[PDB]
Write a protein that binds this ligand. Structure first.
Ligand SMILES: Cc1cc2nc3c(=O)[nH]c(=O)nc-3n(C[C@H](O)[C@H](O)[C@H](O)COP(=O)(O)OP(=O)(O)OC[C@H]3O[C@@H](n4cnc5c(N)ncnc54)[C@H](O)[C@@H]3O)c2cc1C
Ligand SMILES: Cc1cc2nc3c(=O)[nH]c(=O)nc-3n(C[C@H](O)[C@H](O)[C@H](O)COP(=O)(O)OP(=O)(O)OC[C@H]3O[C@@H](n4cnc5c(N)ncnc54)[C@H](O)[C@@H]3O)c2cc1C
Ligand SMILES: N[C@@H](Cc1ccccc1)C(=O)O
Ligand SMILES: N[C@@H](Cc1ccccc1)C(=O)O
Lengths: 477, 478
């Protein structure tokens, strides 16, 4: 248990029913606090949003999209993947939310980059790219070692041990050269009898280096990205519907747009509009999880140095687009089951689904891009976004990318009401971040921006837990 | 799609209801052949065997094991993982057998090897082992490049490109040194506010190189092992129960031990014992999928050079042991969800389950060893296998490995009736003997994973079946 049982009658109002808000309310309720959550949207989860058939969204440009994905088919427009260390998995267990493997690495997906080589714009599988890169890397370090270049820092025994590793890691010939490998894959698959198949031949050392085909390999090593990675069966939003149900909808007001938040003699008073009607609630403490750039728009009595600190958490651009295909060509033709293709094109990456394997249809994330390469979609209409995503995807996966398209749905987080940002980018552990960890009398800020895991649910959930702990210790004093 | 309708009445007898035999029968039926499968066991699938509560097996030493795993819990004693290129996945689609991801790579599982270093017998997570190994590897190659050691094979522009990659790949400092990385993981997890967490510090360069903690990294790159990998929900044997159902149990005789196979005037006559009785069946053709070392034991009229060729496929040793734990300590304490720990100990590896994540119990494959390191278990009783498995596993995963044990079940394939081998190794390894056995012996065709270029993969058995059925069909067409 996070905290013990509270003695007496104590109330909290939670602004925002995303992960930080719902986790706060869940934990406070467990301990015996009175809690009310005010959420502007008509769904729980915030930047955890799962698009299915029937989903409707009107963005800040006034364009309304209506998702028409087939029954049971979806994609996560925000959060989609979870590493093994995150407390998100602990809450999945507590809430009874089934998880499954998320394909965050795949030998069969493609890399495709521009360069001053003949590989420019050419799709190469990860396994082929890796075998060539690690083959030539190993050959080069083995050459230097045999030449005696590392004799000052490696003993004879060190050199022999290193050589053994390099021959294995690079699949080097007996004389220490990279000549290609079964690790690259096969143009024709090995079968039975005298059907030996046909190995894919290697690129040259200069092609590999000058093409930069290994630029994305270190992604595999990210602490928060390395396999094994996980995701909830049926969508990430299931975590937050589970929180909703445990908290009880009697304790959550949806469609409730907060317009004012003030420290008062009697606690904290929050005004909000729900169903076109003006409402007000007062509680002993408030937990404000509204994104920091949106807090200054509220009528408030926050001190000037607090309003200035909130402005330091700069909005960031990111977005996604999902296409439902009526044929799972990526599985049938490319032998790709999950994972992502990676590119320097604006689409940035194409992410293939982790469910309905071997079914008749599925949703492909045709882009997940951020920063400059999301600015390139942000201002386009959905029809224009789709046309650009299909053109760029066809340059990676061929003309099959343009066929058997049923429907599509996009989100751009800077253009999304009640978000207007994918995640915070603090100006310059900064002074403004540290300032916002302190309560403003009875108002506490919480969210993934006030964590060391920004753009992870873990960040939001750990922020909620720390803030609930601080409120509880205060009440005990 | 393989073949398109046969004209008239034609019959095939299939010896063995493992993957090759069942795939053969399935495709022949679809084309309009009369087919009968004779299978010695009471289950379909052969070396694809899934142990669950109720499974009973008496091995060739006379020991009987009775599996008591909880309902829904199992492990694959043979085949368990499938790469994306294998036709096994295409048959899962055709048969409606749902698949899920198999965790074949995991940053959080452990490596544990003996060496003449302080890391000898110490468990290190894959992510820490990789971060140190690739960090120092990258430092050393950058050092050699800067020195001018590779000036005869790399241009100025190549060297800068290589240096850029190495700084990123090895997470090097600005001045080119490996000094640790967040990639190693954390002794305290980064949280909110000023809770930054604490990184795990790096081992020293000579320790890392001499420990051999990177000796298994290349496994990740195997053509048939690289992620993404897959497996059927509920057990690998689900493929072969699905084949069974499509073929029809009326066309499969279980508990049918074949004793004779002979070419005769009208085709092939196969004698077998079933229900205690000596029975005979004659068909136009035969497809023999019995493991090659067991074919010689049959009464037969095969030519001497075919009998000699069958002996070249030497049997091998492999086995597994599964333990059901009543607490999923690997998830709750070690944050391991699937994957395998790897070691030089006899157990060889410890494989964590890919289903029932976050649940209350699970089966861990406490060893999967082959060759010399399976010979260490072969002659042990199950109780002795378990003790050895727990002792060695506790040296990798701690005292927790010894607690919350509910039940266990093991298989050793050389000691398993109607297998007596995990898979074949051809002497001289195509070899002449392999080539010879691709030819029909009048109306008898051999099929199985040993007659493929994917030995020890279901893909080998299935492609062998499809090639042999195509040969028979083209011959019947004329
Ligand atoms: C593109 C993208 C990719 C991501 N990838 C990952 C990933 O794969 N895995 C991972 O774990 N996480 C990922 N995340 C991060 C994850 O979504 C966030 O960390 C998490 O949603 C943060 O929760 P929060 O409660 O701090 O904020 P939010 O989710 O933004 O919740 C804030 C809430 O406040 C509400 N609100 C706003 N204004 C008002 C108002 N005036 N009145 C009342 N309510 C209001 C909003 O509607 C919202 O529900 C991703 C997010 C995005 C957008
Ligand atoms: C430990 C191990 C791990 C493996 N790992 C993988 C993996 O993860 N993925 C994968 O794809 N493959 C794996 N395999 C390989 C896979 O199991 C085989 O490729 C496949 O089972 C071969 O099929 P088969 O029909 O050639 O032979 P078998 O499966 O051996 O079938 C032969 C059949 O003949 C029957 N038989 C024997 N004698 C008689 C008799 N006298 N009369 C009647 N019937 C008889 C047997 O009972 C059996 O059913 C593994 C196998 C083992 C043992
Ligand atoms: N955590 C988010 C944002 C992110 C993307 C890429 C790398 C790091 C951060 C995600 O996994 O998509
Ligand atoms: N195909 C078998 C045997 C094997 C083991 C390791 C590498 C190559 C193949 C398995 O996956 O276990």
């Amino acid at each position: 248990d996070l905290i013990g049982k509270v003695k007496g009658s104590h109330s909290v109002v939670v602004l925002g029913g995303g992960p930080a808000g719902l986790c706060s309310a869940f934990e406070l309720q467990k301990a015996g606090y009175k809690v009310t959550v005010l959420e502007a949207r008509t769904r729980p989860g915030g930047r955890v949003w799962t698009a299915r058939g029937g989903s409707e969204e009107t963005d800040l440009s006034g364009e309304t999209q209506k998702c028409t994905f087939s029954e049971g088919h979806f994609y996560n427009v925000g959060a989609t993947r979870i590493p093994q260390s995150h407390i998100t998995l602990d809450y999945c267990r507590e809430l009874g939310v089934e998880i499954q493997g998320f394909g965050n690495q795949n030998a069969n997906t493609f890399v495709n980059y521009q360069s001053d080589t003949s590989l420019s714009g050419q799709s190469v599988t990860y396994r082929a790219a890796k075998a060539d890169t690690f083959g030539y890397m190993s050959e080069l370090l083995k050459k230097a070692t045999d030449q005696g270049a590392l004799d000052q820092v490696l003993s004879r025994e060190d050199k022999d041990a290193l050589s053994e590793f390099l021959s294995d890691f690079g699949d080097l010939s007996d004389d220490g050269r990279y000549l290609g490998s079964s690790r690259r894959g096969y143009d024709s698959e090995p079968g039975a009898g005298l059907n030996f198949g046909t190995e894919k031949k290697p690129f040259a050392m200069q092609e590999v280096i000058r093409s930069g085909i290994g630029r994305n390999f270190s992604f595999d090593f990210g602490y928060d990205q390395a396999m094994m990675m996980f995701t909830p069966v049926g969508g990430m939003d299931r975590i937050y519907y589970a929180f909703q149900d445990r908290i009880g909808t009697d304790n959550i007001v949806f469609g409730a747009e907060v317009t004012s938040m003030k420290n008062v003699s009697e606690g904290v008073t929050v005004e909000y509009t729900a169903g076109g009607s003006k409402k007000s609630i007062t509680a002993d403490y408030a937990i404000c999880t509204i994104p920091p750039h949106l807090v200054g728009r509220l009528q408030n009595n926050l001190p000037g140095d607090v309003l200035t600190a909130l402005k330091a958490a700069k909005p960031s651009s990111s977005g996604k687009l999902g296409i439902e295909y009526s044929r799972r060509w990526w599985e049938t033709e490319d032998r790709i089951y999950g994972g992502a293709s990676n590119t320097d094109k604006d689409i940035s990456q194409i992410m293939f689904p982790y469910d309905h394997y071997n079914s008749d249809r599925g949703v492909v994330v045709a882009y997940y891009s951020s920063g400059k390469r999301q600015e390139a979609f942000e201002s386009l209409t959905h029809r224009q976004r789709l046309a650009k995503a299909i053109a760029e995807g066809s340059e990676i996966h061929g003309e099959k990318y343009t066929r058997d398209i049923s429907s599509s749905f996009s989100g751009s987080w800077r253009r999304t009401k009640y978000s207007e940002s994918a995640w915070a980018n603090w100006a310059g552990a900064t002074p403004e971040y540290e300032k916002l960890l302190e309560p403003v009398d009875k108002i506490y800020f919480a969210g993934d921006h006030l964590s060391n895991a920004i753009a992870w649910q873990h960040g939001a959930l750990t922020s909620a837990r720390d803030v609930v702990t601080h409120i509880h210790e205060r009440v005990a004093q």
